[PDB]
Protein backbone atom coordinates (compact mmCIF):
# COMPACT_ATOMS: atom_id res chain seq x y z
CA UNK A 1 0.00 0.00 0.00
CA UNK A 2 1.15 3.68 -1.01
CA UNK A 3 1.43 5.63 2.07
CA UNK A 4 2.54 9.49 2.73
CA UNK A 5 1.04 11.45 6.03
CA UNK A 6 1.22 15.19 5.20
CA UNK A 7 0.57 17.74 7.49
CA UNK A 8 -3.24 17.89 6.60
CA UNK A 9 -3.82 13.76 6.55
CA UNK A 10 -2.21 11.06 4.74
CA UNK A 11 -2.37 10.75 1.18
CA UNK A 12 -2.57 7.58 -0.99
CA UNK A 13 -0.92 7.09 -4.14
CA UNK A 14 -0.74 4.52 -7.30
CA UNK A 15 2.35 2.77 -8.97
CA UNK A 16 2.60 3.53 -12.57
CA UNK A 17 4.67 1.61 -14.79
CA UNK A 18 7.28 3.84 -17.23
CA UNK A 19 10.14 2.58 -19.41
CA UNK A 20 10.55 -0.80 -17.29
CA UNK A 21 10.48 0.72 -14.31
CA UNK A 22 7.99 2.55 -11.48
CA UNK A 23 7.15 5.74 -10.49
CA UNK A 24 4.70 6.80 -7.55
CA UNK A 25 1.90 9.23 -8.49
CA UNK A 26 -0.68 11.04 -6.42
CA UNK A 27 -2.78 12.79 -8.41
CA UNK A 28 -4.92 15.14 -6.70
CA UNK A 29 -3.95 16.30 -3.70
CA UNK A 30 -6.22 19.21 -2.29
CA UNK A 31 -4.19 21.99 -1.00
CA UNK A 32 -6.31 25.04 -0.15
CA UNK A 33 -10.39 24.87 1.24
CA UNK A 34 -12.62 24.66 -1.89
CA UNK A 35 -13.32 28.24 -2.97
CA UNK A 36 -16.85 27.97 -2.79
CA UNK A 37 -19.88 30.48 -1.98
CA UNK A 38 -18.47 33.04 0.17
CA UNK A 39 -14.94 32.35 -0.73
CA UNK A 40 -15.46 32.88 -4.19
CA UNK A 41 -13.20 36.21 -5.47
CA UNK A 42 -11.22 35.76 -2.47
CA UNK A 43 -7.43 34.38 -1.88
CA UNK A 44 -7.37 30.34 -1.13
CA UNK A 45 -7.86 29.93 2.20
CA UNK A 46 -5.79 26.82 3.37
CA UNK A 47 -7.33 23.62 4.50
CA UNK A 48 -7.21 22.36 7.71
CA UNK A 49 -7.06 18.38 8.46
CA UNK A 50 -8.73 15.50 7.04
CA UNK A 51 -8.37 12.23 9.54
CA UNK A 52 -8.83 9.54 7.06
CA UNK A 53 -6.86 8.71 3.58
CA UNK A 54 -7.51 10.92 1.14
CA UNK A 55 -7.20 8.28 -2.11
CA UNK A 56 -5.28 10.36 -4.44
CA UNK A 57 -6.10 8.13 -7.53
CA UNK A 58 -7.16 9.94 -9.66
CA UNK A 59 -6.98 13.74 -11.47
CA UNK A 60 -9.10 15.95 -9.90
CA UNK A 61 -11.32 18.84 -11.28
CA UNK A 62 -10.09 21.27 -13.65
CA UNK A 63 -11.51 25.09 -12.93
CA UNK A 64 -14.55 26.90 -13.85
CA UNK A 65 -13.61 27.90 -17.41
CA UNK A 66 -14.49 28.36 -21.12
CA UNK A 67 -13.62 25.88 -23.45
CA UNK A 68 -11.92 26.11 -27.17
CA UNK A 69 -14.99 24.77 -29.69
CA UNK A 70 -13.74 26.38 -32.65
CA UNK A 71 -12.70 23.23 -34.47
CA UNK A 72 -14.89 20.00 -33.21
CA UNK A 73 -13.15 16.95 -33.47
CA UNK A 74 -9.74 18.60 -34.20
CA UNK A 75 -6.42 17.42 -31.63
CA UNK A 76 -4.84 20.14 -32.35
CA UNK A 77 -7.24 22.55 -30.38
CA UNK A 78 -8.74 19.85 -28.42
CA UNK A 79 -5.70 18.45 -26.91
CA UNK A 80 -5.56 21.52 -24.34
CA UNK A 81 -9.22 21.09 -23.41
CA UNK A 82 -9.70 20.19 -20.41
CA UNK A 83 -9.76 16.66 -19.42
CA UNK A 84 -12.03 16.25 -16.01
CA UNK A 85 -15.12 18.22 -15.07
CA UNK A 86 -15.11 21.64 -14.55
CA UNK A 87 -15.98 23.35 -10.81
CA UNK A 88 -15.30 25.70 -8.59
CA UNK A 89 -13.64 22.93 -6.67
CA UNK A 90 -10.43 22.54 -8.51
CA UNK A 91 -7.78 23.71 -5.89
CA UNK A 92 -5.79 20.61 -5.89
CA UNK A 93 -2.14 19.36 -7.48
CA UNK A 94 -0.16 16.18 -8.27
CA UNK A 95 2.88 14.88 -7.41
CA UNK A 96 5.21 11.92 -9.28
CA UNK A 97 8.21 10.24 -7.37
CA UNK A 98 10.57 8.11 -8.64
CA UNK A 99 10.76 4.80 -7.64
CA UNK A 100 12.77 3.66 -5.97
CA UNK A 101 12.00 6.57 -3.26
CA UNK A 102 14.53 9.18 -3.43
CA UNK A 103 16.00 11.06 0.05
CA UNK A 104 16.84 14.67 -1.64
CA UNK A 105 15.37 14.79 -4.85
CA UNK A 106 15.26 18.29 -6.80
CA UNK A 107 11.37 19.11 -7.50
CA UNK A 108 10.29 20.78 -10.75
CA UNK A 109 6.79 22.54 -9.92
CA UNK A 110 4.99 23.39 -12.70
CA UNK A 111 2.10 26.23 -14.15
CA UNK A 112 0.53 25.87 -17.08
CA UNK A 113 -0.59 27.96 -19.69
CA UNK A 114 -3.98 29.14 -21.16
CA UNK A 115 -3.95 33.25 -20.86
CA UNK A 116 -4.83 33.03 -17.41
CA UNK A 117 -8.43 32.00 -18.98
CA UNK A 118 -7.67 28.38 -19.25
CA UNK A 119 -5.75 25.64 -18.89
CA UNK A 120 -5.52 22.60 -16.27
CA UNK A 121 -2.37 20.13 -15.24
CA UNK A 122 -3.95 17.19 -15.99
CA UNK A 123 -3.39 17.54 -19.52
CA UNK A 124 -1.48 14.79 -21.40
CA UNK A 125 1.45 16.54 -22.20
CA UNK A 126 2.39 17.86 -18.56
CA UNK A 127 2.52 14.63 -17.76
CA UNK A 128 5.51 14.30 -14.77
CA UNK A 129 6.14 10.53 -14.53
CA UNK A 130 8.61 10.45 -17.21
CA UNK A 131 10.68 13.18 -15.73
CA UNK A 132 10.34 11.34 -12.40
CA UNK A 133 11.36 8.29 -14.44
CA UNK A 134 14.39 9.24 -16.81
CA UNK A 135 16.06 12.02 -14.31
CA UNK A 136 14.97 10.58 -10.93
CA UNK A 137 13.25 14.15 -10.12
CA UNK A 138 9.89 14.55 -8.25
CA UNK A 139 7.33 17.12 -10.53
CA UNK A 140 4.52 18.62 -8.52
CA UNK A 141 1.84 20.41 -10.69
CA UNK A 142 -1.27 22.14 -9.63
CA UNK A 143 -4.83 23.78 -10.90
CA UNK A 144 -5.16 27.23 -9.91
CA UNK A 145 -8.67 29.82 -10.66
CA UNK A 146 -8.59 30.92 -14.43
CA UNK A 147 -10.81 33.79 -15.52
CA UNK A 148 -12.73 35.94 -13.65
CA UNK A 149 -12.96 33.55 -10.72
CA UNK A 150 -9.27 33.91 -10.76
CA UNK A 151 -8.41 37.61 -11.32
CA UNK A 152 -11.52 39.59 -11.06
CA UNK A 153 -9.99 42.51 -8.99
CA UNK A 154 -10.80 45.56 -7.11
CA UNK A 155 -7.94 46.85 -5.98
CA UNK A 156 -7.94 46.92 -1.84
CA UNK A 157 -10.67 44.99 -1.35
CA UNK A 158 -10.04 41.73 0.67
CA UNK A 159 -13.80 40.25 -0.77
CA UNK A 160 -12.51 40.62 -4.58
CA UNK A 161 -8.87 41.97 -4.59
CA UNK A 162 -7.24 40.53 -7.77
CA UNK A 163 -4.43 37.85 -8.15
CA UNK A 164 -6.37 35.22 -6.64
CA UNK A 165 -5.01 32.58 -9.28
CA UNK A 166 -1.27 33.21 -8.41
CA UNK A 167 -2.00 32.96 -4.40
CA UNK A 168 -3.37 29.87 -5.57
CA UNK A 169 -0.10 28.82 -7.49
CA UNK A 170 1.64 30.29 -4.14
CA UNK A 171 -0.15 28.16 -1.61
CA UNK A 172 0.78 25.00 -3.77
CA UNK A 173 4.43 26.19 -3.76
CA UNK A 174 3.85 26.73 0.19
CA UNK A 175 2.31 22.80 0.12
CA UNK A 176 5.97 22.16 -1.66
CA UNK A 177 7.68 23.63 1.06
CA UNK A 178 5.47 22.12 4.14
CA UNK A 179 5.08 18.75 2.41
CA UNK A 180 7.81 17.78 -0.15
CA UNK A 181 10.63 16.52 2.37
CA UNK A 182 7.54 13.51 3.41
CA UNK A 183 8.28 12.19 -0.40
CA UNK A 184 11.66 12.21 -1.01
CA UNK A 185 12.23 16.01 -2.40
CA UNK A 186 14.26 18.77 -1.50
CA UNK A 187 12.31 22.00 -0.22
CA UNK A 188 15.58 24.00 -0.90
CA UNK A 189 15.86 22.70 -4.56
CA UNK A 190 12.56 23.75 -6.15
CA UNK A 191 12.65 25.01 -9.92
CA UNK A 192 9.36 26.49 -11.03
CA UNK A 193 8.31 25.67 -14.40
CA UNK A 194 5.81 26.63 -16.67
CA UNK A 195 4.39 28.06 -20.45
CA UNK A 196 2.55 31.39 -21.68
CA UNK A 197 0.58 32.33 -19.12
CA UNK A 198 2.71 30.05 -17.03
CA UNK A 199 5.94 31.34 -17.74
CA UNK A 200 4.76 34.65 -16.98
CA UNK A 201 3.72 33.22 -13.56
CA UNK A 202 6.77 32.10 -13.09
CA UNK A 203 8.23 35.48 -13.66
CA UNK A 204 5.84 37.30 -11.34
CA UNK A 205 6.94 34.80 -8.17
CA UNK A 206 10.25 36.27 -8.53
CA UNK A 207 8.87 39.62 -7.78
CA UNK A 208 6.60 38.64 -5.16
CA UNK A 209 8.28 38.50 -1.90
CA UNK A 210 5.66 36.28 -0.68
CA UNK A 211 7.08 33.68 -3.45
CA UNK A 212 10.65 34.85 -2.48
CA UNK A 213 11.94 31.65 -0.04
CA UNK A 214 9.31 28.82 -2.05
CA UNK A 215 11.70 28.17 -4.91
CA UNK A 216 14.97 28.27 -5.72
CA UNK A 217 15.45 28.87 -9.63
CA UNK A 218 13.00 29.22 -12.68
CA UNK A 219 12.49 28.40 -16.12
CA UNK A 220 10.06 30.58 -18.74
CA UNK A 221 9.06 29.04 -21.97
CA UNK A 222 7.27 31.39 -24.28
CA UNK A 223 6.69 34.13 -21.27
CA UNK A 224 7.52 36.45 -19.15
CA UNK A 225 5.14 39.24 -17.53
CA UNK A 226 6.84 42.34 -20.10
CA UNK A 227 4.97 40.82 -22.67
CA UNK A 228 1.96 42.83 -23.94
CA UNK A 229 -0.40 40.46 -22.91
CA UNK A 230 0.71 39.73 -19.57
CA UNK A 231 -0.37 42.69 -17.20
CA UNK A 232 -3.45 45.06 -16.92
CA UNK A 233 -3.25 48.19 -15.33
CA UNK A 234 -5.32 48.13 -12.19
CA UNK A 235 -7.02 51.62 -13.45
CA UNK A 236 -8.46 49.12 -16.44
CA UNK A 237 -8.45 45.67 -14.43
CA UNK A 238 -11.45 47.50 -11.86
CA UNK A 239 -13.30 49.36 -15.35
CA UNK A 240 -13.71 45.21 -16.55
CA UNK A 241 -14.59 44.24 -13.44
CA UNK A 242 -17.69 46.67 -13.65
CA UNK A 243 -18.31 45.88 -16.80
CA UNK A 244 -18.87 42.80 -16.13
CA UNK A 245 -21.54 43.60 -13.30
CA UNK A 246 -23.30 45.61 -15.93
CA UNK A 247 -23.64 42.36 -18.45
CA UNK A 248 -24.94 39.97 -14.86
CA UNK A 249 -27.14 43.06 -13.64
CA UNK A 250 -24.69 43.17 -10.35
CA UNK A 251 -23.68 47.17 -10.74
CA UNK A 252 -24.58 48.40 -7.17
CA UNK A 253 -23.20 51.52 -5.19
CA UNK A 254 -21.06 49.54 -2.57
CA UNK A 255 -18.28 47.60 -3.78
CA UNK A 256 -19.08 44.62 -1.68
CA UNK A 257 -22.49 44.43 -2.23
CA UNK A 258 -21.27 44.34 -6.15
CA UNK A 259 -19.51 41.08 -5.38
CA UNK A 260 -21.80 39.55 -3.47
CA UNK A 261 -24.35 40.06 -6.31
CA UNK A 262 -21.63 37.95 -8.60
CA UNK A 263 -21.48 35.36 -6.01
CA UNK A 264 -25.24 34.31 -6.42
CA UNK A 265 -25.15 34.33 -9.69
CA UNK A 266 -23.74 30.67 -11.75
CA UNK A 267 -20.87 30.29 -12.41
CA UNK A 268 -21.75 29.44 -16.18
CA UNK A 269 -22.97 32.72 -16.70
CA UNK A 270 -20.01 34.57 -15.86
CA UNK A 271 -17.77 32.69 -18.08
CA UNK A 272 -20.32 33.57 -20.79
CA UNK A 273 -19.91 37.52 -19.65
CA UNK A 274 -15.76 37.94 -19.55
CA UNK A 275 -15.54 37.98 -23.34
CA UNK A 276 -17.06 41.17 -23.64
CA UNK A 277 -15.57 42.99 -20.60
CA UNK A 278 -13.11 44.73 -23.18
CA UNK A 279 -14.70 45.75 -26.29
CA UNK A 280 -12.44 43.33 -28.05
CA UNK A 281 -10.61 40.96 -29.38
CA UNK A 282 -7.27 39.69 -30.21
CA UNK A 283 -7.23 36.13 -29.67
CA UNK A 284 -4.49 36.69 -27.35
CA UNK A 285 -6.13 39.09 -25.52
CA UNK A 286 -6.46 38.58 -21.83
CA UNK A 287 -9.38 39.63 -19.92
CA UNK A 288 -9.12 38.99 -16.74
CA UNK A 289 -5.25 38.35 -16.00
CA UNK A 290 -2.75 39.75 -13.10
CA UNK A 291 -2.72 42.99 -12.10
CA UNK A 292 -1.13 45.33 -9.50
CA UNK A 293 -3.34 44.81 -6.48
CA UNK A 294 -0.53 45.76 -3.55
CA UNK A 295 0.07 42.61 -2.35
CA UNK A 296 1.30 39.75 -4.88
CA UNK A 297 2.21 42.56 -6.98
CA UNK A 298 3.38 45.99 -4.78
CA UNK A 299 4.21 47.90 -8.09
CA UNK A 300 4.10 47.98 -11.80
CA UNK A 301 6.47 44.92 -12.93
CA UNK A 302 9.16 46.36 -15.04
CA UNK A 303 9.63 49.34 -12.43
CA UNK A 304 10.52 46.33 -10.13
CA UNK A 305 12.98 44.87 -12.68
CA UNK A 306 14.53 48.05 -13.48
CA UNK A 307 14.50 48.45 -10.08
CA UNK A 308 16.67 45.28 -9.42
CA UNK A 309 13.88 44.15 -6.83
CA UNK A 310 13.47 40.64 -8.04
CA UNK A 311 14.79 37.40 -6.58
CA UNK A 312 18.21 36.57 -7.84
CA UNK A 313 19.22 33.47 -9.29
CA UNK A 314 19.21 31.51 -12.40
CA UNK A 315 16.61 31.24 -15.26
CA UNK A 316 16.33 29.48 -18.20
CA UNK A 317 14.49 31.31 -20.78
CA UNK A 318 13.25 30.80 -24.37
CA UNK A 319 11.03 30.77 -27.06
CA UNK A 320 9.78 29.04 -30.35
CA UNK A 321 10.57 29.51 -33.86
CA UNK A 322 7.03 30.15 -34.83
CA UNK A 323 5.09 31.81 -32.07
CA UNK A 324 2.89 33.75 -33.60
CA UNK A 325 1.25 31.46 -36.14
CA UNK A 326 -1.47 29.58 -33.75
CA UNK A 327 -2.97 32.88 -33.00
CA UNK A 328 -4.16 33.96 -36.77
CA UNK A 329 -6.54 31.19 -37.55
CA UNK A 330 -8.65 32.61 -34.78
CA UNK A 331 -9.79 35.78 -36.65
CA UNK A 332 -7.20 36.96 -38.78
CA UNK A 333 -8.88 36.80 -42.30
CA UNK A 334 -7.72 34.56 -45.30
CA UNK A 335 -6.09 32.26 -42.36
CA UNK A 336 -7.48 28.65 -42.14
CA UNK A 337 -6.10 25.11 -40.65
CA UNK A 338 -7.10 23.75 -43.71
CA UNK A 339 -5.68 26.14 -46.40
CA UNK A 340 -1.86 27.05 -47.00
CA UNK A 341 -3.59 30.42 -46.09
CA UNK A 342 -1.64 32.56 -48.98
CA UNK A 343 -2.79 36.15 -48.16
CA UNK A 344 -2.35 39.11 -49.66
CA UNK A 345 -1.36 42.85 -48.93
CA UNK A 346 -4.65 44.00 -47.50
CA UNK A 347 -5.34 40.56 -45.98
CA UNK A 348 -1.86 41.37 -44.09
CA UNK A 349 -2.64 45.08 -42.98
CA UNK A 350 -6.67 43.72 -42.48
CA UNK A 351 -4.32 41.27 -40.12
CA UNK A 352 -2.47 44.05 -38.36
CA UNK A 353 -5.79 45.74 -37.36
CA UNK A 354 -7.09 42.68 -35.50
CA UNK A 355 -4.01 42.54 -33.63
CA UNK A 356 -3.09 46.30 -33.19
CA UNK A 357 -6.96 47.69 -32.66
CA UNK A 358 -5.45 51.28 -31.05
CA UNK A 359 -2.77 51.53 -33.20
CA UNK A 360 -2.34 54.88 -35.74
CA UNK A 361 -2.47 54.19 -39.45
CA UNK A 362 1.28 55.51 -39.42
CA UNK A 363 2.18 53.05 -36.70
CA UNK A 364 0.55 50.23 -38.66
CA UNK A 365 2.77 51.28 -41.84
CA UNK A 366 5.57 51.45 -40.21
CA UNK A 367 5.61 48.28 -38.58
CA UNK A 368 4.35 46.95 -42.68
CA UNK A 369 7.03 48.37 -44.25
CA UNK A 370 9.45 46.63 -41.39
CA UNK A 371 8.30 42.95 -42.50
CA UNK A 372 8.35 43.50 -46.24
CA UNK A 373 11.75 43.88 -47.04
CA UNK A 374 11.44 40.79 -48.86
CA UNK A 375 14.67 38.28 -49.86
CA UNK A 376 12.54 37.30 -52.76
CA UNK A 377 10.34 40.09 -53.83
CA UNK A 378 8.11 37.37 -55.54
CA UNK A 379 7.65 34.68 -52.67
CA UNK A 380 3.77 34.19 -52.40
CA UNK A 381 3.76 32.90 -48.86
CA UNK A 382 5.77 36.28 -47.77
CA UNK A 383 2.60 38.29 -46.80
CA UNK A 384 1.26 35.29 -44.30
CA UNK A 385 4.90 34.49 -43.11
CA UNK A 386 5.91 38.14 -42.16
CA UNK A 387 1.92 38.42 -39.96
CA UNK A 388 3.24 35.31 -38.12
CA UNK A 389 7.12 36.65 -37.06
CA UNK A 390 5.33 40.42 -36.52
CA UNK A 391 2.88 38.27 -33.97
CA UNK A 392 5.41 36.56 -32.85
CA UNK A 393 7.98 38.66 -32.16
CA UNK A 394 5.87 41.41 -30.43
CA UNK A 395 4.39 39.06 -28.68
CA UNK A 396 6.75 36.49 -27.43
CA UNK A 397 10.77 36.77 -28.76
CA UNK A 398 11.35 40.52 -28.00
CA UNK A 399 9.81 40.65 -24.92
CA UNK A 400 11.74 37.64 -23.78
CA UNK A 401 15.06 38.92 -24.62
CA UNK A 402 14.00 42.22 -23.10
CA UNK A 403 13.74 40.22 -19.97
CA UNK A 404 16.52 38.15 -19.98
CA UNK A 405 19.21 41.07 -20.54
CA UNK A 406 17.36 43.20 -18.12
CA UNK A 407 17.47 40.07 -15.48
CA UNK A 408 20.91 39.32 -16.44
CA UNK A 409 22.23 42.97 -16.05
CA UNK A 410 22.22 42.21 -12.58
CA UNK A 411 24.82 39.43 -12.06
CA UNK A 412 23.01 36.13 -12.34
CA UNK A 413 23.74 33.26 -14.81
CA UNK A 414 20.94 33.68 -17.19
CA UNK A 415 20.54 30.52 -20.16
CA UNK A 416 18.09 31.50 -23.64
CA UNK A 417 17.19 29.03 -26.21
CA UNK A 418 15.22 29.01 -29.47
CA UNK A 419 13.33 25.73 -30.33
CA UNK A 420 13.34 25.35 -33.90
CA UNK A 421 11.97 21.52 -34.68
CA UNK A 422 8.37 21.40 -35.57
CA UNK A 423 7.19 18.01 -34.20
CA UNK A 424 6.91 15.26 -36.61
CA UNK A 425 3.19 14.52 -35.41
CA UNK A 426 1.69 18.28 -34.95
CA UNK A 427 -1.69 17.94 -36.15
CA UNK A 428 -1.79 21.50 -37.70
CA UNK A 429 -0.57 22.79 -41.55
CA UNK A 430 3.05 22.80 -42.24
CA UNK A 431 2.62 26.49 -42.84
CA UNK A 432 2.38 27.18 -39.07
CA UNK A 433 5.54 26.10 -38.18
CA UNK A 434 7.31 25.43 -34.94
CA UNK A 435 4.26 26.60 -33.14
CA UNK A 436 3.43 28.19 -29.97
CA UNK A 437 3.16 25.15 -27.12
CA UNK A 438 4.73 22.80 -28.69
CA UNK A 439 7.70 22.33 -27.22
CA UNK A 440 6.28 21.22 -24.19
CA UNK A 441 5.92 17.75 -25.36
CA UNK A 442 9.23 17.56 -25.70
CA UNK A 443 10.54 19.10 -22.23
CA UNK A 444 7.85 16.38 -20.39
CA UNK A 445 9.64 13.68 -22.30
CA UNK A 446 6.83 12.29 -24.48
CA UNK A 447 8.53 10.94 -27.65
CA UNK A 448 10.74 9.06 -25.18
CA UNK A 449 7.69 6.78 -25.42
CA UNK A 450 8.57 4.56 -28.56
CA UNK A 451 5.30 3.32 -29.17
CA UNK A 452 3.69 7.11 -29.99
CA UNK A 453 5.08 6.82 -33.65
CA UNK A 454 7.57 9.50 -33.03
CA UNK A 455 10.62 9.70 -34.79
CA UNK A 456 14.51 8.46 -33.48
CA UNK A 457 15.68 11.91 -33.75
CA UNK A 458 13.07 13.35 -31.30
CA UNK A 459 13.47 10.79 -28.77
CA UNK A 460 17.33 12.05 -29.10
CA UNK A 461 16.39 15.79 -28.62
CA UNK A 462 13.79 15.13 -26.15
CA UNK A 463 16.03 12.86 -24.01
CA UNK A 464 18.32 16.29 -24.05
CA UNK A 465 16.40 18.57 -23.49
CA UNK A 466 14.73 16.62 -20.74
CA UNK A 467 18.26 16.44 -19.47
CA UNK A 468 19.23 20.15 -19.70
CA UNK A 469 16.20 21.05 -17.87
CA UNK A 470 16.54 18.29 -15.10
CA UNK A 471 20.14 19.54 -14.82
CA UNK A 472 19.54 23.46 -14.96
CA UNK A 473 16.92 22.42 -11.65
CA UNK A 474 19.82 20.50 -10.21
CA UNK A 475 22.62 22.54 -10.55
CA UNK A 476 21.35 25.87 -12.10
CA UNK A 477 23.58 25.10 -15.53
CA UNK A 478 21.69 23.16 -18.44
CA UNK A 479 24.50 21.19 -18.97
CA UNK A 480 23.67 17.75 -20.88
CA UNK A 481 27.06 16.07 -20.17
CA UNK A 482 30.78 17.41 -19.88
CA UNK A 483 31.96 15.43 -23.17
CA UNK A 484 30.08 15.57 -26.51
CA UNK A 485 27.77 18.17 -26.08
CA UNK A 486 27.37 21.89 -27.14
CA UNK A 487 27.99 24.07 -23.63
CA UNK A 488 25.03 26.19 -23.37
CA UNK A 489 26.67 29.87 -22.39
CA UNK A 490 24.86 32.33 -20.33
CA UNK A 491 23.21 35.23 -21.95
CA UNK A 492 24.58 38.39 -21.46
CA UNK A 493 24.04 42.09 -22.45
CA UNK A 494 27.00 42.34 -24.66
CA UNK A 495 26.91 39.28 -26.70
CA UNK A 496 23.53 38.12 -26.17
CA UNK A 497 24.41 34.31 -27.25
CA UNK A 498 21.75 31.18 -26.90
CA UNK A 499 21.44 28.05 -27.62
CA UNK A 500 19.18 26.70 -30.54
CA UNK A 501 17.66 23.18 -30.23
CA UNK A 502 16.70 21.30 -32.91
CA UNK A 503 17.25 17.35 -34.32
CA UNK A 504 19.66 18.55 -37.06
CA UNK A 505 21.94 20.51 -35.06
CA UNK A 506 22.26 22.48 -31.65
CA UNK A 507 24.20 25.36 -32.17
CA UNK A 508 25.41 28.64 -30.39
CA UNK A 509 24.15 32.10 -32.16
CA UNK A 510 23.93 35.18 -31.01
CA UNK A 511 21.31 38.60 -31.04
CA UNK A 512 18.14 36.81 -32.12
CA UNK A 513 15.80 38.60 -34.16
CA UNK A 514 17.74 41.84 -33.37
CA UNK A 515 16.90 43.96 -36.23
CA UNK A 516 13.01 43.10 -35.80
CA UNK A 517 13.11 43.19 -31.60
CA UNK A 518 15.14 46.87 -32.17
CA UNK A 519 11.54 47.66 -33.85
CA UNK A 520 9.39 47.03 -31.29
CA UNK A 521 12.18 48.04 -28.46
CA UNK A 522 13.11 51.75 -30.18
CA UNK A 523 10.43 52.68 -32.45
CA UNK A 524 7.12 50.98 -31.58
CA UNK A 525 6.46 52.52 -28.09
CA UNK A 526 7.09 55.76 -29.84
CA UNK A 527 4.26 55.60 -32.11
C1 LIG B 1 27.25 18.90 -15.22
O1 LIG B 1 26.36 17.87 -15.21
C2 LIG B 1 26.94 16.76 -14.54
C3 LIG B 1 26.09 15.56 -14.87
O2 LIG B 1 26.00 15.38 -16.28
C4 LIG B 1 27.06 17.04 -13.05
O3 LIG B 1 28.06 16.14 -12.57
C5 LIG B 1 27.92 15.38 -11.33
O4 LIG B 1 27.03 14.26 -11.37
C6 LIG B 1 27.33 13.29 -10.35
C7 LIG B 1 26.39 12.13 -10.56
O5 LIG B 1 26.82 11.31 -11.64
C8 LIG B 1 27.21 13.92 -8.96
O6 LIG B 1 27.63 12.97 -7.99
C9 LIG B 1 28.05 15.18 -8.85
O7 LIG B 1 27.80 15.83 -7.60
C10 LIG B 1 27.75 16.13 -10.00
N1 LIG B 1 28.59 17.31 -9.94
C11 LIG B 1 28.42 18.29 -9.05
C12 LIG B 1 29.36 19.45 -9.15
O8 LIG B 1 27.53 18.25 -8.20
C13 LIG B 1 27.58 18.45 -12.74
O9 LIG B 1 27.01 18.91 -11.51
C14 LIG B 1 27.34 19.52 -13.83
N2 LIG B 1 28.41 20.49 -13.77
C15 LIG B 1 28.24 21.82 -13.81
C16 LIG B 1 29.49 22.64 -13.72
O10 LIG B 1 27.13 22.33 -13.93
C1 LIG C 1 3.87 -1.09 -6.69
O1 LIG C 1 2.54 -1.74 -6.49
C2 LIG C 1 2.15 -2.19 -5.17
C3 LIG C 1 1.73 -0.97 -4.39
O2 LIG C 1 0.57 -1.23 -3.60
C4 LIG C 1 3.25 -3.00 -4.47
O3 LIG C 1 2.74 -4.27 -4.10
C5 LIG C 1 4.45 -3.16 -5.39
O4 LIG C 1 5.50 -3.82 -4.69
C6 LIG C 1 4.93 -1.79 -5.83
N1 LIG C 1 6.22 -1.87 -6.51
C7 LIG C 1 6.45 -2.61 -7.61
C8 LIG C 1 7.85 -2.56 -8.14
O5 LIG C 1 5.58 -3.28 -8.15
C1 LIG D 1 -10.61 4.91 -0.98
O1 LIG D 1 -11.01 5.65 0.16
C2 LIG D 1 -12.17 5.09 0.80
C3 LIG D 1 -12.60 6.09 1.85
O2 LIG D 1 -12.49 7.42 1.34
C4 LIG D 1 -11.81 3.72 1.37
O3 LIG D 1 -12.96 3.15 1.98
C5 LIG D 1 -11.31 2.81 0.25
O4 LIG D 1 -10.88 1.57 0.80
C6 LIG D 1 -10.18 3.48 -0.55
N1 LIG D 1 -9.84 2.67 -1.71
C7 LIG D 1 -8.92 1.69 -1.73
C8 LIG D 1 -8.20 1.42 -0.45
O5 LIG D 1 -8.69 1.04 -2.75
C1 LIG E 1 18.91 18.06 1.46
O1 LIG E 1 19.82 19.03 0.95
C2 LIG E 1 19.95 20.22 1.74
C3 LIG E 1 20.88 21.14 0.99
O2 LIG E 1 20.55 21.17 -0.40
C4 LIG E 1 20.46 19.85 3.13
O3 LIG E 1 20.57 21.02 3.94
C5 LIG E 1 19.52 18.85 3.77
O4 LIG E 1 20.03 18.44 5.03
C6 LIG E 1 19.34 17.63 2.86
N1 LIG E 1 18.38 16.70 3.43
C7 LIG E 1 18.58 15.38 3.50
C8 LIG E 1 19.89 14.88 2.96
O5 LIG E 1 17.75 14.62 3.98
C1 LIG F 1 -15.13 51.20 -19.22
O1 LIG F 1 -15.93 50.22 -19.94
C2 LIG F 1 -16.87 50.70 -20.91
C3 LIG F 1 -17.37 49.46 -21.63
O2 LIG F 1 -18.79 49.44 -21.76
C4 LIG F 1 -16.23 51.70 -21.88
O3 LIG F 1 -17.23 52.29 -22.70
C5 LIG F 1 -15.47 52.77 -21.11
O4 LIG F 1 -14.82 53.65 -22.03
C6 LIG F 1 -14.44 52.12 -20.21
N1 LIG F 1 -13.62 53.12 -19.54
C7 LIG F 1 -12.28 53.05 -19.51
C8 LIG F 1 -11.66 51.87 -20.20
O5 LIG F 1 -11.61 53.90 -18.95
C1 LIG G 1 -9.42 29.34 -47.05
O1 LIG G 1 -8.93 30.51 -47.73
C2 LIG G 1 -9.90 31.48 -48.15
C3 LIG G 1 -9.14 32.56 -48.88
O2 LIG G 1 -9.58 33.86 -48.50
C4 LIG G 1 -10.65 31.99 -46.93
O3 LIG G 1 -11.62 32.95 -47.33
C5 LIG G 1 -11.33 30.82 -46.25
O4 LIG G 1 -12.02 31.27 -45.09
C6 LIG G 1 -10.30 29.75 -45.85
N1 LIG G 1 -10.97 28.59 -45.27
C7 LIG G 1 -11.93 27.87 -45.88
C8 LIG G 1 -12.49 26.73 -45.09
O5 LIG G 1 -12.31 28.12 -47.02
C1 LIG H 1 3.10 3.78 -35.28
O1 LIG H 1 1.71 3.55 -34.82
C2 LIG H 1 1.50 3.10 -33.47
C3 LIG H 1 1.53 4.33 -32.59
O2 LIG H 1 0.38 4.40 -31.74
C4 LIG H 1 2.53 2.05 -33.08
O3 LIG H 1 1.89 1.03 -32.31
C5 LIG H 1 3.14 1.45 -34.33
O4 LIG H 1 3.98 0.35 -33.99
C6 LIG H 1 3.95 2.52 -35.05
N1 LIG H 1 4.50 2.00 -36.30
C7 LIG H 1 3.76 1.62 -37.35
C8 LIG H 1 4.52 1.12 -38.54
O5 LIG H 1 2.53 1.66 -37.34
CL1 LIG I 1 17.85 40.93 -3.81
Not at 164 to 181: E, H, R, S, Y
Request: aromatic letters at 14%; proline letters at 6%.
Amino acid sequence: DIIIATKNGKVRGMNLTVFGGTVTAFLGIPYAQPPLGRLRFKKPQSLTKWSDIWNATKYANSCCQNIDQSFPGFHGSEMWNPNTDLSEDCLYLNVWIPAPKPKNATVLIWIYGGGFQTGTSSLHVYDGKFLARVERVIVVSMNYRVGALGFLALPGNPEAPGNMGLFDQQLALQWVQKNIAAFGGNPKSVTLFGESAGAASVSLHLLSPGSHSLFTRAILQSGSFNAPWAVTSLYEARNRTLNLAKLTGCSRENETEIIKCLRNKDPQEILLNEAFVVPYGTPLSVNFGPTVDGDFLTDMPDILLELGQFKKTQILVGVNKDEGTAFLVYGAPGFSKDNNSIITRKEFQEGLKIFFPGVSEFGKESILFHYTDWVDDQRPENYREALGDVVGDYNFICPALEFTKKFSEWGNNAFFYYFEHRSSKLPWPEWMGVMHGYEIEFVFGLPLERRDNYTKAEEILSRSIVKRWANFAKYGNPNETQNNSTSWPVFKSTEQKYLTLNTESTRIMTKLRAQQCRFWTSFFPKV
